[PDB]
Design an enzyme around this catalytic site. Sequence first.
Site, PDB file in Angstrom:
ATOM      1  NE  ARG A  46       2.519   0.599   3.382  1.00 48.80           N
ATOM      2  CZ  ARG A  46       3.690  -0.024   3.417  1.00 48.80           C
ATOM      3  NH1 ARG A  46       4.076  -0.621   4.533  1.00 48.80           N
ATOM      4  NH2 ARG A  46       4.472  -0.047   2.337  1.00 48.80           N
ATOM      5  CD1 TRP A  94      -7.274   8.663  -1.723  1.00 47.37           C
ATOM      6  CD2 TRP A  94      -8.247   8.842   0.284  1.00 47.37           C
ATOM      7  NE1 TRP A  94      -6.337   9.143  -0.847  1.00 47.37           N
ATOM      8  CE2 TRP A  94      -6.905   9.267   0.393  1.00 47.37           C
ATOM      9  CE3 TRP A  94      -9.064   8.862   1.430  1.00 47.37           C
ATOM     10  CZ2 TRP A  94      -6.350   9.720   1.610  1.00 47.37           C
ATOM     11  CZ3 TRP A  94      -8.512   9.312   2.649  1.00 47.37           C
ATOM     12  CH2 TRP A  94      -7.169   9.735   2.721  1.00 47.37           C
ATOM     13  CD  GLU A 128      -5.717   2.155  -6.694  1.00 48.70           C
ATOM     14  OE1 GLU A 128      -6.149   1.072  -6.232  1.00 48.70           O
ATOM     15  OE2 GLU A 128      -5.794   3.236  -6.056  1.00 48.70           O
ATOM     16  CB  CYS A 184      -0.926  -0.008   1.218  1.00 52.50           C
ATOM     17  SG  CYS A 184      -2.085   1.351   1.136  1.00 52.50           S
TER      18      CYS A 184
HETATM   19  C1  HEM Z   1      -6.546   6.195   1.698  1.00 59.44           C
HETATM   20  C2  HEM Z   1      -5.718   5.943   0.634  1.00 59.44           C
HETATM   21  C3  HEM Z   1      -5.362   4.719   0.034  1.00 59.44           C
HETATM   22  C4  HEM Z   1      -4.535   4.713  -1.040  1.00 59.44           C
HETATM   23  C5  HEM Z   1      -4.166   5.913  -1.948  1.00 59.44           C
HETATM   24  C6  HEM Z   1      -4.052   3.376  -1.185  1.00 59.44           C
HETATM   25  C7  HEM Z   1      -3.360   2.930  -2.321  1.00 59.44           C
HETATM   26  C8  HEM Z   1      -3.145   1.580  -2.673  1.00 59.44           C
HETATM   27  C9  HEM Z   1      -2.533   1.092  -3.898  1.00 59.44           C
HETATM   28  C10 HEM Z   1      -2.237   1.875  -5.194  1.00 59.44           C
HETATM   29  C11 HEM Z   1      -2.337  -0.244  -3.748  1.00 59.44           C
HETATM   30  C12 HEM Z   1      -2.130  -1.282  -4.840  1.00 59.44           C
HETATM   31  C13 HEM Z   1      -3.531  -1.340  -5.427  1.00 59.44           C
HETATM   32  C14 HEM Z   1      -3.649  -2.339  -6.544  1.00 59.44           C
HETATM   33  O1  HEM Z   1      -2.806  -2.278  -7.471  1.00 59.44           O
HETATM   34  O2  HEM Z   1      -4.584  -3.177  -6.492  1.00 59.44           O
HETATM   35  C15 HEM Z   1      -2.751  -0.568  -2.436  1.00 59.44           C
HETATM   36  C16 HEM Z   1      -2.655  -1.836  -1.909  1.00 59.44           C
HETATM   37  C17 HEM Z   1      -3.128  -2.214  -0.671  1.00 59.44           C
HETATM   38  N1  HEM Z   1      -3.640  -1.366   0.268  1.00 59.44           N
HETATM   39 FE1  HEM Z   1      -4.087   0.580   0.062  1.00 59.44          FE
HETATM   40  N2  HEM Z   1      -4.600   2.541  -0.219  1.00 59.44           N
HETATM   41  C18 HEM Z   1      -5.457   3.324   0.492  1.00 59.44           C
HETATM   42  C19 HEM Z   1      -6.170   2.817   1.629  1.00 59.44           C
HETATM   43  C20 HEM Z   1      -6.002   1.517   2.215  1.00 59.44           C
HETATM   44  C21 HEM Z   1      -6.587   1.069   3.454  1.00 59.44           C
HETATM   45  C22 HEM Z   1      -7.641   1.849   4.291  1.00 59.44           C
HETATM   46  C23 HEM Z   1      -6.007  -0.181   3.745  1.00 59.44           C
HETATM   47  C24 HEM Z   1      -6.231  -1.089   4.791  1.00 59.44           C
HETATM   48  C25 HEM Z   1      -7.014  -0.808   5.863  1.00 59.44           C
HETATM   49  C26 HEM Z   1      -5.116  -0.467   2.680  1.00 59.44           C
HETATM   50  C27 HEM Z   1      -4.424  -1.708   2.556  1.00 59.44           C
HETATM   51  C28 HEM Z   1      -3.780  -2.156   1.404  1.00 59.44           C
HETATM   52  C29 HEM Z   1      -3.427  -3.520   1.131  1.00 59.44           C
HETATM   53  C30 HEM Z   1      -3.497  -4.700   2.061  1.00 59.44           C
HETATM   54  C31 HEM Z   1      -3.029  -3.562  -0.159  1.00 59.44           C
HETATM   55  C32 HEM Z   1      -2.628  -4.744  -1.031  1.00 59.44           C
HETATM   56  C33 HEM Z   1      -3.908  -5.375  -1.596  1.00 59.44           C
HETATM   57  C34 HEM Z   1      -3.628  -6.417  -2.674  1.00 59.44           C
HETATM   58  O3  HEM Z   1      -2.714  -7.239  -2.450  1.00 59.44           O
HETATM   59  O4  HEM Z   1      -4.333  -6.406  -3.723  1.00 59.44           O
HETATM   60  N3  HEM Z   1      -5.123   0.550   1.727  1.00 59.44           N
HETATM   61  N4  HEM Z   1      -3.317   0.524  -1.782  1.00 59.44           N
HETATM   62  N1  LIG Z   2      -6.750   3.083  -3.501  1.00 61.76           N
HETATM   63  C1  LIG Z   2      -7.269   1.933  -3.095  1.00 61.76           C
HETATM   64  N2  LIG Z   2      -7.706   1.843  -1.845  1.00 61.76           N
HETATM   65  N3  LIG Z   2      -7.348   0.886  -3.948  1.00 61.76           N
HETATM   66  C2  LIG Z   2      -7.907  -0.451  -3.639  1.00 61.76           C
HETATM   67  C3  LIG Z   2      -7.817  -1.431  -4.820  1.00 61.76           C
HETATM   68  C4  LIG Z   2      -8.619  -0.900  -6.008  1.00 61.76           C
HETATM   69  C5  LIG Z   2      -8.276  -1.490  -7.394  1.00 61.76           C
HETATM   70  N4  LIG Z   2      -6.818  -1.359  -7.701  1.00 61.76           N
HETATM   71  C6  LIG Z   2      -9.093  -0.766  -8.480  1.00 61.76           C
HETATM   72  O1  LIG Z   2      -8.485  -0.117  -9.360  1.00 61.76           O
HETATM   73  O2  LIG Z   2     -10.341  -0.841  -8.442  1.00 61.76           O
END
Ligand code: HEM
Ligand SMILES: NC(=[NH2+])NCCC[C@H](N)C(=O)O
Lengths: 409, 411
Positions: free
Chosen positions: A111, A280, A285, A108
């Site tokens: 974070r 968000w 993405e 993520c």
């Molecule tokens: C608020 C802003 C957030 C942004 C901008 C963000 C952004 C992202 C991005 C770009 C990735 C890779 C997404 C993909 O390619 O599928 C990612 C992965 C991930 N995020 Fe976030 N995230 C957000 C919120 C969260 C929250 C609230 C959590 C957990 C409570 C979280 C947990 C994770 C996890 C576990 C992954 C890996 C998921 C996977 O393996 O497909 N993220 N996030």
């Molecule tokens: N910014 C996030 N929380 N992304 C969560 C995964 C969403 C997914 N990569 C999509 O394009 O629909």
Amino acid sequence: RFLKVKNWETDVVLTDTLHLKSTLETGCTEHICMGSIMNPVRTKDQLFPLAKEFLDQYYSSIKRFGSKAHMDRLEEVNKEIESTSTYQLKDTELIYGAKHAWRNASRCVGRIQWSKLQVFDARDCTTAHGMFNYICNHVKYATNKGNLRSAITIFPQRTDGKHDFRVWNSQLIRYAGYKQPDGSTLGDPANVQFTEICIQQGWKAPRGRFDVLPLLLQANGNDPELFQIPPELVLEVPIRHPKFDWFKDLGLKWYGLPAVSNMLLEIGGLEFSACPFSGWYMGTEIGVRDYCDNSRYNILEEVAKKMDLDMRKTSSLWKDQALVEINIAVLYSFQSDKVTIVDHHSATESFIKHMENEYRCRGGCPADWVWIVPPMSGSITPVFHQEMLNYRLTPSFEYQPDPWNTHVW
Amino acid sequence: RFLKVKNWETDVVLTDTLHLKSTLETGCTEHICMGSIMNPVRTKDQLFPLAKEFLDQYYSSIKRFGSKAHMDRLEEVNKEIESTSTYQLKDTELIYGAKHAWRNASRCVGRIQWSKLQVFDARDCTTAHGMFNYICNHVKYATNKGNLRSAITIFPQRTDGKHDFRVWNSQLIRYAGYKQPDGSTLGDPANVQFTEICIQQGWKAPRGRFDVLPLLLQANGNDPELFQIPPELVLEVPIRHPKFDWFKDLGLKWYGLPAVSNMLLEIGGLEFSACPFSGWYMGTEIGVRDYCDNSRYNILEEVAKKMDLDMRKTSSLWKDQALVEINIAVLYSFQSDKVTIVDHHSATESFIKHMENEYRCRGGCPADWVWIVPPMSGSITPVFHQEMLNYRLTPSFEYQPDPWNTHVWKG
Ligand code: HEM
Ligand SMILES: NC(=[NH2+])NCCC[C@H](N)C(=O)O
Ligand code: HEM
Ligand SMILES: C[C@H](O)[C@@H](O)c1cnc2nc(N)nc(N)c2n1
Ligand SMILES: C[C@H](O)[C@@H](O)c1cnc2nc(N)nc(N)c2n1
Ligand SMILES: NC(=[NH2+])NCCC[C@H](N)C(=O)O
Ligand SMILES: [Zn+2]
């Protein structure tokens, strides 16, 4: 033992000590690295340790490490485990556990917001209708009229693997996928199989291109049920370009709330199999992956044509030119409709800042370069030049088998 | 043990068996992955095995494994080793070794060309002047008036570690970089330090923004010496845009022959410290990294201004829009001048086929995702969606410390 990571653009050098506490495996060895591989019931004796590990860090975070309170809790849990063969987390432990699972999510890039997570304790839930009510409340709270607020809703933990709660959808909100007679695919190819299971369960598929899928909820091990998310709760954004007015003609729209829902949350050995969470979007993405991936809405060629770019030869970089415009459009449409969203430049810069913060305040930050670097303009974002150390800390979010390949009807 | 890699775009699954013959380390453990980290004399004792493994693979490839020639050569080598504490490769084994070091380079996306490598044997070279002549022939042959040919020149191997041959340059052709007293940098920031050494060694720097650096060559462990590459041998390309007539006024140009010269070639345990090699450019190396890294020519801003983009807020993707234009310009200028070059779509597409072929006919293809995926437009190139396995096989190309950090000067 003690490692260093250098940013090859700023020559900054952070020293990692946090990985020493690493728990899980990485899928790699001295012989072979699997960094680019997507994915490389507990008994009493297994749980005591994990539980002890968790409480130590918990009490250590509240500056009462080795206090009486600390010892007391550790004793109470150990008793409860011996007797019940599991235990219940205090509300405070749950919130800390969830926020930290996000803090440890090495994939993520968002974070830096980790500590602000809103936690909805849904551990008192008993039915699928209860789950639907909890989810709607989550979607509403998080969407917040476009001013998105990160959140997570936690359903009951696993007991014997036979009374697991699950959300069969991979995201709370996603577009359906139907394989047409044309041989082609209508909607989102990524969810073709999930869509079939909905229909196979009763869903009255509208057969459109952007049909919001129905929630399929499994409570206490029973068979999953269907519910249609109150349309008035699913915020959406029609996609237009700030210059190309022919753009709106592609009839493209995307939802504003990204909410991963098929993951498993582990806190102190306990396993929360139904734990949807949301934040968000980072523009790329949707713009880069959902819209242009060859196995998704694959709209590159169309957009290329409308732009009258020489698509005769790959070297004209028409795919690249188009990719940029689709991403300007996405970011554009969201900001205009006033929905939270972040561009890859801003997001990566924030993650770099967060990393430095993490290295000094915690001694490190597990990060997976392969997933951190955006799918477009890689080397012009700072994280590209940033060396990273990937390791697994807990609490954590894990992958888990799609329930349909597991559910015993 | 068999390992499988999937392609999340075509669901195609491949099986790796080749990793079983992996020897060197990866910097990674089960507790930590270092896949995104830049970089994580031998005795008779340790040389015998390395030599044998090599000759075995060599003889298997020519389909003479276990033959009498295979056995005699193996006995010939061992006698030689314990006799002189090292051994000499035959021309054929050297060629084979070189080609395979390339074939095993997991960070190289141009490997589909591994078998067509032209190998120049410079093992009879004894002086820096001799090295310079060899280097001129390589540049001339490889450039071939714009129709580039991959090649490599191999100088004498390491013996006691006190008589090493080295090419102090990191690439045979590269532009100088000069730190200005006001803090800015004229030229290529990447070569500032080496440029300083060249000046200290007696080089009269013209101090422009695209000065071709002189060669600094070390023969048989002696102090390096300077040599100017004949200008008529250095092919260059003026950079212009197919539709932006003002692009050419940016004053940009680039050399046509990419020739890495600071790596170490390991074959059969033997170490070749000076082994410059060259192929041809993939557009992004120049247009994305050399021109747009903030630590190289950093031209995104200027290009941005001239196109007049909304540079007020990153969310306009102005940086992204300029990057594309610059890369279009690089590909266009080289093609117009008929200088071999390949865009990233074509190269990655080609690399995916080479990789599949390699699993089928070899049982695997070691690959570093981090380096294979291009620095721009990553997910719209096939390699992005491809799982890879990174492991090191020999023969191989290795990093070695910059020579100025280790050389014992003679004066
Ligand atoms: C608020 C802003 C957030 C942004 C901008 C963000 C952004 C992202 C991005 C770009 C990735 C890779 C997404 C993909 O390619 O599928 C990612 C992965 C991930 N995020 Fe976030 N995230 C957000 C919120 C969260 C929250 C609230 C959590 C957990 C409570 C979280 C947990 C994770 C996890 C576990 C992954 C890996 C998921 C996977 O393996 O497909 N993220 N996030
Ligand atoms: N910014 C996030 N929380 N992304 C969560 C995964 C969403 C997914 N990569 C999509 O394009 O629909
Ligand atoms: C045919 C033309 C060639 C193309 C298009 C090609 C392409 C590339 C590219 C894009 C990279 C990464 C470049 C960078 O970021 O610095 C690379 C790495 C590499 N290539 Fe090639 N290459 C070619 C020929 C060769 C040859 C002839 C050899 C070997 C004799 C070779 C050996 C390597 C090695 C060892 C690396 C990794 C170098 C490092 O670690 O810095 N390549 N190549
Ligand atoms: C896992 C495969 O290497 C490839 O499908 C891959 C690589 N990096 C990624 N990074 C991010 N952020 N998302 C996805 N889906 C990615 N997928
Ligand atoms: C080594 C660091 O992770 C980062 O500087 C990095 C990542 N990927 C790369 N990939 C390629 N092809 N070249 C270079 N120089 C790269 N550098
Ligand atoms: N395609 C090659 N053989 N490249 C060799 C390395 C060149 C280096 N990336 C540069 O931009 O100068
Ligand atoms: Zn690894």
